Amino acid sequence: HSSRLHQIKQEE
Amino acid sequence: HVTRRTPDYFL
Amino acid sequence: NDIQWCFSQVKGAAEADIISTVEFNHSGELLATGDKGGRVVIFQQEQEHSRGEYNVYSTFQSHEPEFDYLKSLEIEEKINKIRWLPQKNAAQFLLSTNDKTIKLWKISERDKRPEGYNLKEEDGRYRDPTTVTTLRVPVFRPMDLMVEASPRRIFANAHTYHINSISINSDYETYLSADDLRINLWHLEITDRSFNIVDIKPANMEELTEVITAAEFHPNSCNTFVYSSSKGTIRLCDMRASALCDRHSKLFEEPSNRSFFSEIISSISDVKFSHSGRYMMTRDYLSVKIWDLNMENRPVETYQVHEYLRSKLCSLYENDCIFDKFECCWNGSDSVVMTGSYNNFFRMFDRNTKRDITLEASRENNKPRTVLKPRKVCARKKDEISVDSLDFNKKILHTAWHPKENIIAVATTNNLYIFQDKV
Amino acid sequence: SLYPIAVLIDELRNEDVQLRLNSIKKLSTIALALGVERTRSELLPFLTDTIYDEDEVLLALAEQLGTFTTLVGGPEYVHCLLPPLESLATVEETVVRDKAVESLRAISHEHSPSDLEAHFVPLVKRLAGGDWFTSRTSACGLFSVCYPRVSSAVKAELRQYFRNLCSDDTPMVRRAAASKLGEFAKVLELDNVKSEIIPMFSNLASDEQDSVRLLAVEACVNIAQLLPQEDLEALVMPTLRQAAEDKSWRVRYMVADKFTELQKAVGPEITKTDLVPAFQNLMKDCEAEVRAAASHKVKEFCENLSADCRENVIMSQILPCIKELVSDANQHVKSALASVIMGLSPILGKDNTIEHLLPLFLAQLKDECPEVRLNIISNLDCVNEVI
């Protein structure tokens, strides 16, 4: 949830 | 703006 | 052997006030801090070795909150990194960045003002121009010293993702800025275009496996820079080889700890070249590793920041602490490296002796030139601190070491502590 | 009728940059009305070190100060303009310093030889030895104008000061010294060029900084034109060969970018012996930027070859390399050739053009990239007259 890599995948 | 070709200032 | 550190100063006390970066300038006389509110505060050392105290020197709003209309997202004004430029002239220059924009700030002293008018008085009271016959040029007069900060250049719109690093080249011309997937090269005097030298973005974001966590230029070599990834590897690039640095010249990585969290804790949060530039230091969640640039396959030294947490990773995951991005820093001689921990503990590792000390940044010792007592953590003998009693909200993420002296700036959430060697 | 002047003078204090900028552009009017004596004693001290420091305002101020010689009382008092310009030659903005140095060079010609040694040369020493590398960077551009018109004793001091700048700790200063090394050598006596310029040229050409070494290629062209052809082999060529083989692609790019200029300087004999092998290596460089830079010079380089061996060298040494470049993966390398390859037809003649050049023309006309095809079509003028 808080992983920066995960945030990027969700965003794009 | 952001380019992968070398800009003049670095050539 | 051990440096006897002493309380010297505490500054500060709200989310906006939380310090987000600390950085000494090249001479060490100036100290800059950024906070989540977008404000930069500069402290100047009293120059009446030098152990004078630091006093507020300048304060300005580096970044303002902004809204990304194109994607309907707020842009944080938090100051991620501050980097000082080498002193060009009497004025001082530093680069300040948030997630999207880098700003070049000029901080200059002024001690005179113009005086004298032809058509009016200093009060602003005008007079009939018909009676004005003899011209007079204004004359500069001394005034009380003041420090002015103005933004000279804005480097904007070049990053799609969040900026994590800025680093100045040794050539005095260029600096890099790295977001999660791209590294861009800038000329310090050109804002309208930047050179994208590294791009690890995959064709399909579904296949994304690595993000850039930190990037830094070599202190001496103009052509060398490194960047680390979430997978725990450091790639050393040579700009001489080719214009684009997609091919690394060296790759640093290590080959009973394969836990579920192994992938998380291995991410490198900070990478620092030693002043000499022969060694490189990386901080991950649990350990500090020092790399010889001639040895790709393993670090030459490894230090454990806080082992007692290795068993508590489950708890740390559940409260998101496991994702904290701690930093590290060398001392001037490269003999001692400092990094932060929880419960306002910060750790010193002496490389020559391989000795450790744990120190606490707390107001309980708020008496100048009072020695800091080494702390001990136990999973409890006299004066030992139980692991379960540690406050994980008290994080020392940002620390800075004076370039020449035994002076360190340790930032807690709200307060900036300055400690000095006992003299 | 002095009211309009009063408005302009007061506007110099105005917070509005535009109004303040307007008055600066009209300093000539202000100085003209005030008078020669008042201008020296009242106006210039106000302009000597201004707190307002916009790049546009300072740039305008530097331009104006270069035309104030008549307003200050002519050449007899031209030295009064130095302090205002000395301040502008220290600011952080590069263009403002460049303009200020330009104005200093302009008013130097109006200094009498006595004034140069009394007021101007001391200014150069202050900048050259200043604590701030902005001033030292500016000083590099002032040596060439004052050197010719000063005594031998002063000349020896100037050459020593310029030598220190070439060894500065700051790369910013060494880049400036490398840039100005060529024009300073042009005013030096030939004996000092061989004895003093060459050691500095050799050192800067082996500097750690890539950005400094690449500037030595320009210095190579300037120094080569000064020395006799017999001395190029001993003094210049060893440094030029290192540049062509330099590990930095940026340094090799400059050699390729200025290859024809080097060809003229060294001469036909050195060109055959050294440049032709060097040109082949550049055309096969690992970096596409270098290959594209060399592709632009194919026509000019072949044209300037001596007629004794031009056609033979092109066919045996240069032409094989062009064939590889036609199939180069990089789009920009192929585009560069397409705009100049057609120019080899007059050199080689009809028979050679059809046998060797024509297959390459057909290959590039069938290339997928529209830019390559457009470039070939745009340059059919030369080929038509041959075939």
Residue numbers in the entry:
A (entry chain D): 81 to 92
B (entry chain C): 299 to 309
C (entry chain B): 8 to 20, 26 to 60, 66 to 272, 276 to 399, 403 to 446
D (entry chain A): 9 to 395
The paper states:
Inhibition of PP2A:B55 is achieved by the intrinsically disordered proteins ARPP195,6 and FAM122A7. Here, we report the single-particle cryo-electron microscopy structures of PP2A:B55 bound to phosphorylated ARPP19 and FAM122A. Consistent with our complementary NMR spectroscopy studies, both intrinsically disordered proteins bind PP2A:B55, but do so in highly distinct manners, leveraging multiple distinct binding sites on B55.
The interaction of FAM122A with PP2A:B55 is different to that of ARPP19, with FAM122A residues 81–111 binding PP2A:B55 with two helices. Residues L85F and I88F are adjacent in space, which enables them to bind the same hydrophobic pockets on B55 used by ARPP19 (L49R/L53R). Residue R84F forms intramolecular polar and ionic interactions with Q87F and E91F that stabilize the helix. These interactions also allow R84F to form a bidentate salt bridge with D197B. Lys89F binds the carbonyls of L3/4 residues M222B, E223B and L225B. Mutating the basic–hydrophobic residue pairs—that is, 84RLHQIKQEE92 to 84AAHQIKQEE92 (84AA85) and 84RLHQAAQEE92 (88AA89)—reduced FAM122A binding by 1.6- and 2.0-fold, respectively.
